[model samples]
Target: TRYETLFQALDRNGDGVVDIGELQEGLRNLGIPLGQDAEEKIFTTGDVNKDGKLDFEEFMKYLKDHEKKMKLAFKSLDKNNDGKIEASEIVQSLQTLGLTISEQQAELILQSIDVDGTMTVDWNEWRDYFLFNPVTDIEEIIRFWKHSTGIDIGD
Candidate 1:
């Protein structure tokens, strides 16, 4: 359902693929402010075929891969860096990200990532359950940006 709604919103032309413009507007409608560079970053991340557009399968792949990246973000919530993330930490992290989720929402987020019912996220739980992609280097990230936008460095 999440993807169905989102894909429909992004596929403005109903052409079954989401192009850069539609992707930009979709993200904007969701309150995500994406500049040209940021938009390309996202587009390239999901446009696995380098076709300059995102198909439903591509978008779903990106979301799945993105979960790994989210696990990396868990460190921000691990205040003490003790490899443990508490519900309070998650809530605080969400607030910092400009998201004001209700207590139930917070619980749901934790539940999705917490498999052991320990009520806390340890390193094993984070790595094994949360899933995350390794952080892309700045150069590689920039490369994707360039490839997506087709703008030369001098431009």
Candidate 2:
């Protein structure tokens, strides 16, 4: 998968840990430079050990396990594949599973992670919010959302 290769490259400082600068530089070298906001979000949540650096295990752990599963959650919400989760989309995704959140409630969830005052939530904003959480999936998202927010969610 060439993951450890990049991990080796990212840990270029000869330490097992990859700091944010190296994480940023490594991706940039590979021609996928994301914004500073995204980089911070990426590393901040990717490191599961709370060590302030992304260890190789932590890197793949988040990438392979959490990210993939979170995508399943995200893809279900983003039926349009435009990578945008409109409030309507959120409502629909929930209703299909026998739950419902009003559009106003949907936007409230987006605002928590949109960061730029956006009405629609993007993929980047998504994993950063949930990847750090205890679980990942549409079902738990509904469960978590209801227990936490308890807004206009229909039974």
Candidate 3:
């Protein structure tokens, strides 16, 4: 689960959102490549209510925003009202950003999202899975990076 992954990533010392060091270490492990400006942006983004360190609630909220965005993206892409997302639909969306993705890449994306082995995803399914909120999933972190920077980490 993303929440479990987030717990492990943030709890670097096994102390559960213990401190900034763990957060920094987790971001580093993901190769997020944050400079001072980026770091400041993250602080501003995650430090809800302006506490120096981000508590789990704040972190989860930030992750939920991404999940919401992804749910929106999924809904927007499922234009046919058919409940299925085609690789071409995903590829086409990526293409608009001048990015090309392999079928394998698209499939990998679905693997993270497809919960019921049904290959079709409705908005209810969409929101429910992403609702877990992977605060520290590396791929999700990278995805957050791409969303924030308009950069594509593709294969």
Candidate 4:
């Protein structure tokens, strides 16, 4: 009920594959959506058959391969080299970039990766979500966080 469920949900128009447009909505929903290149990266590198879209096998395989990349990205976000990433890590991390954010603000950032609404992102949850996301490093994720937090969440 994991990858298959995601494939079923994001495979738009009953095509049984994922295109860039369809990809964004899912990632956006995940709160860590990147840009066109990010979407393209999956198909370009992960689409083994060069089918112009990701079939179930390709989708599953790509994520597994990308998990290695997500690990480092995960560690960088998990400041203090802890096994978890909570608002405490988030708030302090942003301060180094000159953003004086509150703990609540940090929580908002934390929630982006907090899939279970667990108030934190553990390595498993982090890998689950971002393994499919085409992020190169922590700086890229921080940029996304900065931009996402910049706008009003419409609360």
Candidate 5:
């Protein structure tokens, strides 16, 4: 899983903490080259004390923030009142959010969630199978606007 890769990479010393150097090296190991500005942005996410290091708690907090953000985005997309999300709901959701995605892409996302082709994604089904399983894929969904449309996802 990408989250596993990221977690193991961050815990470089295997000591359950991530120092700035460890994070920098980890990103390098992942082929995600980081410039000074990018490093600053990354560090600010985990280095809560401005000490340029991340203890276990700090790293956990950082991870939780990512989870929280993704959860919100997922919730925003699941608009059906049925407790399960439908394809039409997802398509409409993108429109409501001003996101540009082809129906095929939306269908692919739904297919990624609905392996049985039932056209519905329950919260648990969505969570374990799609939203939080391969965390980087989930992150990419959250970061889609930023990467493709040059829009800041933080907003």
Candidate 6:
């Protein structure tokens, strides 16, 4: 029932579905002033099924899917099959994503979430710092490092 209040509030006209207008208005009321194009993108993403509206179920699915996408994005940055990510790897990965940051800046970014005094980041550290980490399986660490070359020696 946690989503019921929010879904009802966004439904606006009691129709039980959220259209782009309602979504945009809800976002605006919440002070997230995204542009029309961005609003449409958010709407479409939440619409799932390619439908033009977001029912509560669709919104729930979108939330779950977005979390998965974010995890994959984290995986993409951890290019070495070592259970950790180094500052250099962070720099290089961000560059691939069109973000050209200096090594110093990269270190700063790493330091922000490097909980274990290691300059590298494990999946636990990454998840804890960014979103929320509720991982319960040991193999999830392997999954995080599955897309890399080799774990860095320093990490």
Candidate achieving the largest TM-score? 4
Tens digits of per-residue lDDT for model 4, 88-145:
8766666665556688777766776687888988888877666656765676666666
lDDT of 1 at 76: 69
Question: What is the per-residue lDDT of model 6 for residues 6-67, given as tens digits with 9 covering 90 to 100?
Answer: 67988999888988788777766643223446457666566777778888898767656645
TM-score of 4: 0.66
At residue 49, what lDDT does model 6 achieve?
76
Which stretches of model 3 miss by more than 4 angstroms? 1-5, 14-18, 31-40, 82-84, 94-155
Better of 1 and 5 by TM-score: 5
Total clashes for model 2: 0
Q: Which stretches in model 1 have alpha-carbon errors above 4 Å?
A: 79-155
**What are the per-model numbers of colliding residue pairs?**
4, 0, 0, 0, 0, 1
Instruction: Enumerate residue pairs that collide in model 4.
Output: none
Error of 1 at 72 (Å): 3.0
Per-residue lDDT of model 5, residues 79-128, tens digit only: 75556777677667766666565666566666755756687776655654
User: Residue 77 in candidate 3 has what lDDT?
Assistant: 60
CA deviation > 4 Å runs, candidate 4: 12-16, 19-33, 36-38, 80-82, 91-104, 115-118, 128-132, 151-155
Best by lDDT: 2
Each candidate: what lDDT?
A: 0.60, 0.74, 0.58, 0.72, 0.59, 0.61
TM-score (all chains, Cα) for each model: 0.50, 0.61, 0.50, 0.66, 0.56, 0.48
Question: Which stretch of 10 consecutive residues in model 6 shows the poorest summed lDDT?
Answer: 146-155
Which candidate do you rate higher for TM-score, 2 or 6? Answer: 2
